[PDB]
Amino acid sequence: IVGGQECKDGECPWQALLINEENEGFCGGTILSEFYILTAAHCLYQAKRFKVRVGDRNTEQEEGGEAVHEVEVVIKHNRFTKETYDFDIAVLRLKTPITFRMNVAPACLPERDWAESTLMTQKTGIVSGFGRTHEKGRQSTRLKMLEVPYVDRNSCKLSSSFIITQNMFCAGYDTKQEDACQGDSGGPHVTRFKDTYFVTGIVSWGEGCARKGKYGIYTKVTAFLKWIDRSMKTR
Amino acid sequence: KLCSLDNGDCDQFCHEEQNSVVCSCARGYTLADNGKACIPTGPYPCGKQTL
Ligand SMILES: O=C1CN(S(=O)(=O)c2ccc3cc(Cl)ccc3c2)CCN1CC1(/C=N/O)CCN(c2ccncc2)CC1
Numbered sequence: 387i388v389g390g391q392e393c394k395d396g397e398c399p400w401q402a403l404l405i406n407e408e409n410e411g412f413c414g415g416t417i418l419s420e421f422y423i424l425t426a427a428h429c430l431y432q433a434k435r436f437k438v439r440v441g442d443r444n445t446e447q448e449e450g451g452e453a454v455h456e457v458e459v460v461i462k463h464n465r466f467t468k469e470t471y472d473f474d475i476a477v478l479r480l481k482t483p484i485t486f487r488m489n490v491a492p493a494c495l496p497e498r499d500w501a502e503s504t505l506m507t508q509k510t511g512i513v514s515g516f517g518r519t520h521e522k523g524r525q526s527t528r529l530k531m532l533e534v535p536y537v538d539r540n541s542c543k544l545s546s547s548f549i550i551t552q553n554m555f556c557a558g559y560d561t562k563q564e565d566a567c568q569g570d571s572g573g574p575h576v577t578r579f580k581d582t583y584f585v586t587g588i589v590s591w592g593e594g595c596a597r598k599g600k601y602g603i604y605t606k607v608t609a610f611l612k613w614i615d616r617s618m619k620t621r
Numbered sequence: 622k623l624c625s626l627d628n629g630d631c632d633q634f635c636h637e638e639q640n641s642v643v644c645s646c647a648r649g650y651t652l653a654d655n656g657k658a659c660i661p662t663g664p665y666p667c668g669k670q671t672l
């Protein structure tokens with residue numbers, strides 16, 4: 387997360403961090419239920435074996451309120467391709483149930499139509515993670531969040547040096563130095579509605595971090611809703 | 622009808638059933654009696670900051 391504020395106690399409970407055997411946090415994730423985690427598919431390429439962590443806000447000050455979980459099954463989207471970042475989604479079925487407490491709660495899955503009509507038409511959304519603070523910088527030790535305005539789909543395609551598919555959408559700023567960054571991949575993008583947050587996008591990619599004239603590219607969750615349900619039945 | 626008015630005055634999901642509006646809630650909520658509001662069923666409902 388470049389810019390943005392710090393996730394204050396209880397503000398980003400649906401956050402999840404994928405960690406390698408070296409125990410380093412490399413990607414993000416969203417808590418859907420006690421058994422399922424949502425993430426980017428390209429993230430299942432930045433580590434051999436990895437666990438998923440929840441309830442953490444400071445990767446060094448053992449808040450004692452954290453909890454690590456093992457992955458039983460990784461459900462990667464078949465049509466996912468690295469050469470286009472299309473279908474950049476994935477679902478993780480946990481080995482043990484996540485116990486919900488402070489800083490550990492699930493984000494809501496919205497209805498496909500309502501979402502596109504009332505959620506993505508909202509002025510902004512929230513993206514969060516333990517990713518780099520700057521393009522060249524280092525991974526963050528604290529969990530951050532950033533209000534990123536929804537970007538016009540046309541402005542998006544125009545500013546992009548790559549094909550922005552139907553499975554993606556832009557969010558962020560043209561010039562302001564704020565946007566997700568490395569390590570934030572797979573993390574959550576949520577939209578607020580009457581004090582309830584709904585999942586809307588999976589941190590996918592970008593051309594650099596917070597560069598002038600470039601936006602943040604997220605996976606369009608509403609375009610994979612049904613796929614996600616199917617996965618909740620492990621398929 | 623008119624879920625485009627003010628979300629139909631629903632707390633969450635809004636659907637227009639030909640005539641009027643039909644509100645619904647995410648998994649883990651139950652529609653209030655006014656057929657609009659959503660109420661949690663457990664202590665950690667999806668979408669709520671835990672404070
Ligand atoms: O420039 C980069 C930046 N990093 S990054 O680790 O800091 C990174 C990763 C995820 C991000 C998500 C958001 Cl919302 C915002 C910023 C991000 C920055 C990832 C890789 N690249 C190189 C790429 C080139 N951009 O300059 C990223 C996207 N590519 C395609 C190809 C065909 N179709 C679509 C996209 C190919 C390589």
Ligand SMILES: [Ca+2]
Nearest residue numbers: 444447448449
């Ligand atoms: Ca900690």
